[PDB]
Amino acid sequence: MKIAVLPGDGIGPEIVNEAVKVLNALDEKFELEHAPVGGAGYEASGHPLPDATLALAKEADAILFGAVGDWKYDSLERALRPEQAILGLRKHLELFANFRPAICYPQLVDASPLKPELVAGLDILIVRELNGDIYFGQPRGVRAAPDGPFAGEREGFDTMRYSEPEVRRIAHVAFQAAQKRAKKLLSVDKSNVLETSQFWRDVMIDVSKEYADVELSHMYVDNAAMQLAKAPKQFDVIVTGNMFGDILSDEASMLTGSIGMLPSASLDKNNKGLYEPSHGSAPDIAGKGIANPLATILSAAMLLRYSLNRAEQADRIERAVKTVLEQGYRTGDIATPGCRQVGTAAMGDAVVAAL
Amino acid sequence: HHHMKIAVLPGDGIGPEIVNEAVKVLNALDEKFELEHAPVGGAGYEASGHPLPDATLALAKEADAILFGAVGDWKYDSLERALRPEQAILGLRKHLELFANFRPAICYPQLVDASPLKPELVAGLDILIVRELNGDIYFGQPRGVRAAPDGPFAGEREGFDTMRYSEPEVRRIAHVAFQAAQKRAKKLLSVDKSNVLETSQFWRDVMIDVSKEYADVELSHMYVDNAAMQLAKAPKQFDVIVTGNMFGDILSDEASMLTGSIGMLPSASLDKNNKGLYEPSHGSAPDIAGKGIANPLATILSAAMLLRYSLNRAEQADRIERAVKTVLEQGYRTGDIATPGCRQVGTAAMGDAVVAAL
Ligand SMILES: [Mg+2]
Ligand SMILES: [Mg+2]
């Protein structure tokens, strides 16, 4: 079982080093191999996704990814910027199914901007389509406007599009997730205005015929933004497109109060996945030894459960995280009154000790 | 001896009920205004066979600003689509070139428990979202369903829409938002997805070009995902936010929910000269139409926006806004915002309380 470890930039190495520490403390023998990605990829060989790094990711059974991006690299030309690595891995490896848990941990309820009764016990799952939508749709660019009242003027444009098989495959994923949970699926679109969205909804309804045991509901993205804020525990699984899922997953993450706890998984048709913290880069603390590693460690638990058929090992990691939280360990971002405040490495050590 | 002229378009159902109270508050002020009424919506249909009678449009064009109630009712829902009351909203925006949708997010401390947020995050909120209303993916061509013309799924059934914004479209919404920021705390946040969308990078570049005419306003940028997070975390961090049609729809709705009383919220649609149509954000309520219980506060607050943003009359706007704050302090509530121990009143008695607090 081969894992490609792609730590990235800034806090990425710091946090991934702790996930690797946790993986190495398990009974099982993994083949871990590291490769540069993001700014580190540019520094090593002039591209955020070096050919050799992509090749390693393709060969592996799963990918454990840190975070990319730093101030140092913001000046590079757009195509060589660190963030292009994430997009390239998703595209080249056909990782179309993104899973974003939003969980509020009992020790950390007060961190939420919501009144505590709205978030205590929150555990919902957003499924985000990751390979299509307006984020990739052609054509796109800047042009002279070809028509309308502003014909001839400079105009920026992108094309939103979704084909039948693209909606079908992410629908099935989302229904399968709902079957294993509370058997409730909400599909989010903007079908009262967008043709792409009505098409999405039609396909979702067609797929729903195959899952008579799952209650399908639909909601417009504007109303979903409202309803996540009002009462996020009304939902269980939510499925939506690339763009709307980017916005809603991030909203849901913030409503938990602690984005440093939340992992992300991006999977292909065979459940090979890239597993990463959901939170992204943190240039203000990068390299200072204080970033929360728990999202990244929990992403390694997801990796074991969903790609490497090691659910018992995933269970052990998740139990160890619960235990360290109950023992009072907190990194700076989740510090609570009277806690044992620790940096990244000492947090990792606490998790290992609780395995 | 020159008076400003306000076109008053009450509409249907609750529309006349709430607008009567905004007119009452305007008339209680010291300065005289020329308030001229005209029918719109179903009332326009009853008078002239169209939801936007020619004479109503002419009055709106002639006037310095427009105060609009709400249109729509069950009795008009059987009309053919083009004559339905709600068409008037679209007609006015199109004909008057009202492209900037002003959507305040305000939270009164007396009503803070209706917010899902911890009260310290939201009590006394007063931020402004300026949403481009006329363009974006919501209207862009081409769009529809087709066989995919290219790509890895070529030949498959595919739905599609086109996001597009031209230079004049972004430039005009930038000017309006920058000018709003000057009438507030001189901070403007532009929201886009410029890391991914070509439309958004273009938007950002035009916003920056415009910003060079407003050196006194601090411009910053934020991605729409991040803004969705930050509105939930700490909405008080903002002053004015400007964004496109679609992102503004989502973010303004999110913000409206975070205030907890979507029913108190005023709205406006402005042109390039800051002439605006001012209306409560809520629209029709056929269930309570004519029953004298609708909350007029959003409409009264819309009349305050009218004075501030269209008529260069910020001190009068402040006086109205202070009066609303006062009646809430005094314990007045309409049925929609009733709190334990309150003085519960209908529309007219709420209007009377605001007049008394001026
Ligand atoms: Mg995001
Ligand atoms: Mg909306």
mmCIF file of N, CA and C in Angstrom, chain A residues 92-154:
data_model
loop_
_atom_site.group_PDB
_atom_site.id
_atom_site.type_symbol
_atom_site.label_atom_id
_atom_site.label_comp_id
_atom_site.label_asym_id
_atom_site.label_seq_id
_atom_site.Cartn_x
_atom_site.Cartn_y
_atom_site.Cartn_z
ATOM 1 N N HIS A 92 -5.875 15.681 -13.421
ATOM 2 C CA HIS A 92 -5.129 14.560 -14.004
ATOM 3 C C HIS A 92 -5.492 13.204 -13.430
ATOM 4 N N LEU A 93 -5.847 13.153 -12.148
ATOM 5 C CA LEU A 93 -6.232 11.918 -11.471
ATOM 6 C C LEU A 93 -7.757 11.678 -11.444
ATOM 7 N N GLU A 94 -8.525 12.559 -12.074
ATOM 8 C CA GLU A 94 -9.977 12.364 -12.211
ATOM 9 C C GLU A 94 -10.643 12.190 -10.838
ATOM 10 N N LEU A 95 -10.236 13.049 -9.906
ATOM 11 C CA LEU A 95 -10.787 12.991 -8.547
ATOM 12 C C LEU A 95 -12.043 13.845 -8.518
ATOM 13 N N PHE A 96 -13.151 13.319 -9.027
ATOM 14 C CA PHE A 96 -14.354 14.143 -9.207
ATOM 15 C C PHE A 96 -15.231 14.263 -7.957
ATOM 16 N N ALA A 97 -15.010 13.417 -6.945
ATOM 17 C CA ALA A 97 -15.924 13.379 -5.786
ATOM 18 C C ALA A 97 -15.214 13.918 -4.560
ATOM 19 N N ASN A 98 -15.599 15.110 -4.119
ATOM 20 C CA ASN A 98 -15.020 15.743 -2.932
ATOM 21 C C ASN A 98 -15.943 15.566 -1.721
ATOM 22 N N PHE A 99 -15.382 15.127 -0.594
ATOM 23 C CA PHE A 99 -16.131 14.928 0.632
ATOM 24 C C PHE A 99 -15.647 15.901 1.670
ATOM 25 N N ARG A 100 -16.563 16.721 2.175
ATOM 26 C CA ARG A 100 -16.214 17.744 3.165
ATOM 27 C C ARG A 100 -17.083 17.571 4.422
ATOM 28 N N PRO A 101 -16.560 16.880 5.438
ATOM 29 C CA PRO A 101 -17.305 16.831 6.705
ATOM 30 C C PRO A 101 -17.311 18.193 7.426
ATOM 31 N N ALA A 102 -18.435 18.525 8.059
ATOM 32 C CA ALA A 102 -18.485 19.649 8.953
ATOM 33 C C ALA A 102 -18.947 19.060 10.276
ATOM 34 N N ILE A 103 -18.022 19.008 11.229
ATOM 35 C CA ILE A 103 -18.245 18.429 12.564
ATOM 36 C C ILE A 103 -17.870 19.474 13.613
ATOM 37 N N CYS A 104 -18.699 19.629 14.653
ATOM 38 C CA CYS A 104 -18.379 20.516 15.766
ATOM 39 C C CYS A 104 -18.080 19.613 16.967
ATOM 40 N N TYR A 105 -16.839 19.667 17.460
ATOM 41 C CA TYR A 105 -16.370 18.801 18.566
ATOM 42 C C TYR A 105 -16.883 19.380 19.888
ATOM 43 N N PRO A 106 -17.269 18.506 20.828
ATOM 44 C CA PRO A 106 -17.910 18.987 22.067
ATOM 45 C C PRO A 106 -17.025 19.907 22.899
ATOM 46 N N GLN A 107 -15.715 19.684 22.877
ATOM 47 C CA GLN A 107 -14.806 20.555 23.613
ATOM 48 C C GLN A 107 -14.696 21.970 23.047
ATOM 49 N N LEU A 108 -15.119 22.134 21.802
ATOM 50 C CA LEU A 108 -14.831 23.310 21.021
ATOM 51 C C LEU A 108 -16.100 24.066 20.598
ATOM 52 N N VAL A 109 -17.242 23.725 21.181
ATOM 53 C CA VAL A 109 -18.516 24.340 20.786
ATOM 54 C C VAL A 109 -18.497 25.870 20.871
ATOM 55 N N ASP A 110 -17.801 26.429 21.861
ATOM 56 C CA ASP A 110 -17.806 27.893 22.080
ATOM 57 C C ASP A 110 -17.091 28.683 21.000
ATOM 58 N N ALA A 111 -16.274 27.991 20.200
ATOM 59 C CA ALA A 111 -15.550 28.624 19.099
ATOM 60 C C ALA A 111 -16.479 29.002 17.951
ATOM 61 N N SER A 112 -17.597 28.299 17.836
ATOM 62 C CA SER A 112 -18.598 28.559 16.793
ATOM 63 C C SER A 112 -19.190 29.974 16.943
ATOM 64 N N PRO A 113 -19.378 30.674 15.817
ATOM 65 C CA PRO A 113 -20.122 31.939 15.850
ATOM 66 C C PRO A 113 -21.603 31.724 16.161
ATOM 67 N N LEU A 114 -22.106 30.500 15.997
ATOM 68 C CA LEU A 114 -23.507 30.196 16.294
ATOM 69 C C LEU A 114 -23.743 29.973 17.773
ATOM 70 N N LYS A 115 -24.969 30.263 18.196
ATOM 71 C CA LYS A 115 -25.391 29.894 19.547
ATOM 72 C C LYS A 115 -25.137 28.398 19.712
ATOM 73 N N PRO A 116 -24.659 27.976 20.884
ATOM 74 C CA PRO A 116 -24.161 26.567 21.034
ATOM 75 C C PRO A 116 -25.201 25.464 20.712
ATOM 76 N N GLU A 117 -26.468 25.692 21.060
ATOM 77 C CA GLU A 117 -27.510 24.712 20.761
ATOM 78 C C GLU A 117 -27.720 24.455 19.277
ATOM 79 N N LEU A 118 -27.262 25.368 18.423
ATOM 80 C CA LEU A 118 -27.424 25.152 16.980
ATOM 81 C C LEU A 118 -26.303 24.281 16.410
ATOM 82 N N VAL A 119 -25.179 24.178 17.129
ATOM 83 C CA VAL A 119 -23.993 23.454 16.635
ATOM 84 C C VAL A 119 -23.513 22.266 17.465
ATOM 85 N N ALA A 120 -24.004 22.127 18.692
ATOM 86 C CA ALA A 120 -23.615 20.999 19.533
ATOM 87 C C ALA A 120 -24.029 19.722 18.823
ATOM 88 N N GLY A 121 -23.074 18.831 18.643
ATOM 89 C CA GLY A 121 -23.348 17.593 17.961
ATOM 90 C C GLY A 121 -23.431 17.659 16.449
ATOM 91 N N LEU A 122 -23.102 18.802 15.849
ATOM 92 C CA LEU A 122 -23.207 18.910 14.388
ATOM 93 C C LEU A 122 -22.303 17.887 13.714
ATOM 94 N N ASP A 123 -22.870 17.170 12.752
ATOM 95 C CA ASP A 123 -22.123 16.255 11.920
ATOM 96 C C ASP A 123 -22.902 16.133 10.608
ATOM 97 N N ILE A 124 -22.487 16.922 9.624
ATOM 98 C CA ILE A 124 -23.054 16.849 8.269
ATOM 99 C C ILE A 124 -21.946 16.671 7.257
ATOM 100 N N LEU A 125 -22.325 16.289 6.043
ATOM 101 C CA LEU A 125 -21.359 15.965 5.033
ATOM 102 C C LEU A 125 -21.769 16.650 3.766
ATOM 103 N N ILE A 126 -20.853 17.443 3.222
ATOM 104 C CA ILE A 126 -21.073 18.052 1.938
ATOM 105 C C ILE A 126 -20.288 17.278 0.882
ATOM 106 N N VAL A 127 -20.999 16.865 -0.170
ATOM 107 C CA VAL A 127 -20.394 16.228 -1.336
ATOM 108 C C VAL A 127 -20.363 17.260 -2.458
ATOM 109 N N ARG A 128 -19.165 17.581 -2.926
ATOM 110 C CA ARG A 128 -18.941 18.626 -3.903
ATOM 111 C C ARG A 128 -18.371 18.012 -5.178
ATOM 112 N N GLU A 129 -19.052 18.229 -6.296
ATOM 113 C CA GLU A 129 -18.518 17.838 -7.608
ATOM 114 C C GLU A 129 -17.255 18.644 -7.892
ATOM 115 N N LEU A 130 -16.179 17.972 -8.322
ATOM 116 C CA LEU A 130 -14.860 18.603 -8.326
ATOM 117 C C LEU A 130 -14.148 18.699 -9.671
ATOM 118 N N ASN A 131 -14.686 18.091 -10.720
ATOM 119 C CA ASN A 131 -13.992 18.057 -12.009
ATOM 120 C C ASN A 131 -14.674 18.870 -13.124
ATOM 121 N N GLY A 132 -15.826 19.473 -12.850
ATOM 122 C CA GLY A 132 -16.581 20.154 -13.878
ATOM 123 C C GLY A 132 -17.023 21.530 -13.454
ATOM 124 N N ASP A 133 -18.157 21.973 -14.012
ATOM 125 C CA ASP A 133 -18.756 23.264 -13.683
ATOM 126 C C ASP A 133 -18.062 24.453 -14.370
ATOM 127 N N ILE A 134 -18.539 25.639 -14.054
ATOM 128 C CA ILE A 134 -17.952 26.891 -14.478
ATOM 129 C C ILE A 134 -16.463 27.048 -14.145
ATOM 130 N N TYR A 135 -15.972 26.292 -13.166
ATOM 131 C CA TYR A 135 -14.552 26.363 -12.775
ATOM 132 C C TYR A 135 -13.611 25.820 -13.883
ATOM 133 N N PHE A 136 -14.139 24.961 -14.761
ATOM 134 C CA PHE A 136 -13.362 24.427 -15.896
ATOM 135 C C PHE A 136 -13.981 24.700 -17.284
ATOM 136 N N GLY A 137 -15.219 25.188 -17.323
ATOM 137 C CA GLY A 137 -15.994 25.176 -18.564
ATOM 138 C C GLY A 137 -15.454 26.060 -19.672
ATOM 139 N N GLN A 138 -15.419 25.518 -20.887
ATOM 140 C CA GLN A 138 -14.973 26.285 -22.049
ATOM 141 C C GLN A 138 -16.176 26.693 -22.901
ATOM 142 N N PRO A 139 -16.100 27.851 -23.586
ATOM 143 C CA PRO A 139 -14.981 28.791 -23.571
ATOM 144 C C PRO A 139 -14.986 29.774 -22.378
ATOM 145 N N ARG A 140 -13.853 30.447 -22.203
ATOM 146 C CA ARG A 140 -13.653 31.377 -21.113
ATOM 147 C C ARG A 140 -12.472 32.290 -21.453
ATOM 148 N N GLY A 141 -12.464 33.493 -20.907
ATOM 149 C CA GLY A 141 -11.380 34.412 -21.186
ATOM 150 C C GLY A 141 -11.813 35.854 -21.132
ATOM 151 N N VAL A 142 -11.140 36.664 -21.934
ATOM 152 C CA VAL A 142 -11.506 38.054 -22.144
ATOM 153 C C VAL A 142 -11.523 38.279 -23.644
ATOM 154 N N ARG A 143 -12.480 39.066 -24.102
ATOM 155 C CA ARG A 143 -12.823 39.216 -25.509
ATOM 156 C C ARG A 143 -13.477 40.572 -25.731
ATOM 157 N N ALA A 144 -13.748 40.887 -27.000
ATOM 158 C CA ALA A 144 -14.704 41.924 -27.323
ATOM 159 C C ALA A 144 -16.108 41.298 -27.231
ATOM 160 N N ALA A 145 -17.028 41.945 -26.528
ATOM 161 C CA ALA A 145 -18.359 41.370 -26.357
ATOM 162 C C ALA A 145 -19.002 41.129 -27.732
ATOM 163 N N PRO A 146 -19.404 39.869 -28.041
ATOM 164 C CA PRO A 146 -19.884 39.545 -29.394
ATOM 165 C C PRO A 146 -21.292 40.051 -29.694
ATOM 166 N N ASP A 147 -22.039 40.428 -28.654
ATOM 167 C CA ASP A 147 -23.442 40.787 -28.813
ATOM 168 C C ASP A 147 -23.972 41.465 -27.547
ATOM 169 N N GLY A 148 -25.256 41.821 -27.562
ATOM 170 C CA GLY A 148 -25.889 42.559 -26.466
ATOM 171 C C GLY A 148 -25.607 44.057 -26.493
ATOM 172 N N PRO A 149 -26.141 44.804 -25.504
ATOM 173 C CA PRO A 149 -26.013 46.271 -25.447
ATOM 174 C C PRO A 149 -24.596 46.792 -25.312
ATOM 175 N N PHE A 150 -23.685 45.938 -24.860
ATOM 176 C CA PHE A 150 -22.298 46.317 -24.703
ATOM 177 C C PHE A 150 -21.423 45.625 -25.743
ATOM 178 N N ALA A 151 -22.025 45.220 -26.870
ATOM 179 C CA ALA A 151 -21.264 44.677 -28.014
ATOM 180 C C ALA A 151 -20.031 45.528 -28.308
ATOM 181 N N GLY A 152 -18.885 44.868 -28.509
ATOM 182 C CA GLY A 152 -17.617 45.538 -28.823
ATOM 183 C C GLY A 152 -16.722 45.909 -27.652
ATOM 184 N N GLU A 153 -17.307 46.056 -26.463
ATOM 185 C CA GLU A 153 -16.552 46.405 -25.251
ATOM 186 C C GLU A 153 -15.722 45.225 -24.747
ATOM 187 N N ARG A 154 -14.684 45.502 -23.967
ATOM 188 C CA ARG A 154 -13.904 44.431 -23.349
ATOM 189 C C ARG A 154 -14.843 43.719 -22.388
#
